């Protein structure tokens, strides 16, 4: 169902799609534009890292992430609240929270998109790649570049499948024969567009 937590059966870490519409169709990240799929009364099921917030860092097994909204203070509502709920700590919309036992938190599927490349060496060079399950360690408010409050999150990887950029993850990609997926007819249309 749309509120599925965890990996999608049959879609291993390292899977690559050229376009977001394909990522949506796979169920790995259902929204075709929004960066985060979540329900404010439940949790977050997936997110896409595609750059945008300059203060964010991406170190592969861990990354920081900034919420949405705000012009004005962001609020811990909607998908900001969804992602917060995944953290293994009671929700706190004033100071945020940190999970000591963060691995007991709800999983988030993470896809990296090529747009993230200026500030991340882990972004794929093309398209979108599924990088596995991550969990929210902590989240907190802070004064943004706008001068208004933004919600920030720290995520850490927790997946039994190795990271796609590691030697063991690259070996799996090879063994499974994963390749960049293009829509039916797309390469053919480009080839003929002359």
UniProtKB/Swiss-Prot annotation:
Binding residues annotated for DNA, in chain numbering: 50-51, 56
Residues found modified as N6-acetyllysine: 121
Domain characteristics, as noted in the entry: The tudor-like regions specifically recognize and bind histone H3 unmethylated at 'Arg-2' (H3R2me0), while the PHD-type zinc finger specifically recognizes and binds histone H3 trimethylated at 'Lys-9' (H3K9me3). The tudor-like regions simultaneously recognizes H3K9me3 through a conserved aromatic cage in the first tudor-like subdomain and unmodified H3K4 (H3K4me0) within a groove between the tandem subdomains. The YDG domain (also named SRA domain) specifically recognizes and binds hemimethylated DNA at replication forks (DNA that is only methylated on the mother strand of replicating DNA). It contains a binding pocket that accommodates the 5-methylcytosine that is flipped out of the duplex DNA. 2 specialized loops reach through the resulting gap in the DNA from both the major and the minor grooves to read the other 3 bases of the CpG duplex. The major groove loop confers both specificity for the CpG dinucleotide and discrimination against methylation of deoxycytidine of the complementary strand.
Source organism (scientific name): Homo sapiens (Human)
Source lineage: Eukaryota, Metazoa, Chordata, Craniata, Vertebrata
Role this protein plays: Multidomain protein that acts as a key epigenetic regulator by bridging DNA methylation and chromatin modification. Specifically recognizes and binds hemimethylated DNA at replication forks via its YDG domain and recruits DNMT1 methyltransferase to ensure faithful propagation of the DNA methylation patterns through DNA replication.
Site residues (Required to confer preferential recognition of cytosine over thymine), renumbered to this chain: 66
Disease: Defects in UHRF1 may be a cause of cancers. Overexpressed in many different forms of human cancers, including bladder, breast, cervical, colorectal and prostate cancers, as well as pancreatic adenocarcinomas, rhabdomyosarcomas and gliomas. Plays an important role in the correlation of histone modification and gene silencing in cancer progression. Expression is associated with a poor prognosis in patients with various cancers, suggesting that it participates in cancer progression.
Superkingdom of this protein's organism: Eukaryota
Quaternary organization: Interacts with DNMT3A and DNMT3B. Interacts with DNMT1; the interaction is direct. Interacts with USP7; leading to its deubiquitination. Interacts with histone H3. Interacts with HDAC1, but not with HDAC2. Interacts with BLTP3A. Interacts with PML. Interacts with EHMT2. Binds hemimethylated CpG containing oligonucleotides. Interacts with ZNF263; recruited to the SIX3 promoter along with other proteins involved in chromatin modification and transcriptional corepression where it contributes to transcriptional repression. Interacts with UHRF2. Interacts with FANCD2.
Post-translational modification: Ubiquitinated; which leads to proteasomal degradation. Autoubiquitinated; interaction with USP7 leads to deubiquitination and prevents degradation. Polyubiquitination may be stimulated by DNA damage.
Residue segments, region Required to promote base flipping: 32-33
Glycyl lysine isopeptide (Lys-Gly) (interchain with G-Cter in SUMO2) crosslink location in chain: 121
Region (Required for formation of a 5-methylcytosine-binding pocket): 53-56, 65-68
Tissue-wise expression: Expressed in thymus, bone marrow, testis, lung and heart. Overexpressed in breast cancer.
Induction, per UniProt: Up-regulated in proliferating cells, and down-regulated in quiescent cells. Down-regulated upon adriamycin-induced DNA damage, in a p53/TP53 and CDKN1A-dependent way. Induced by E2F1 transcription factor.
Residues of the full protein shown: 414 to 617 of 793
Subcellular location per the Swiss-Prot or TrEMBL entry: Nucleus
Domain YDG: 6-157
Reported effect, residue 30 to A: Decreased ability to bind DNA
Name under which the protein is recorded: E3 ubiquitin-protein ligase UHRF1
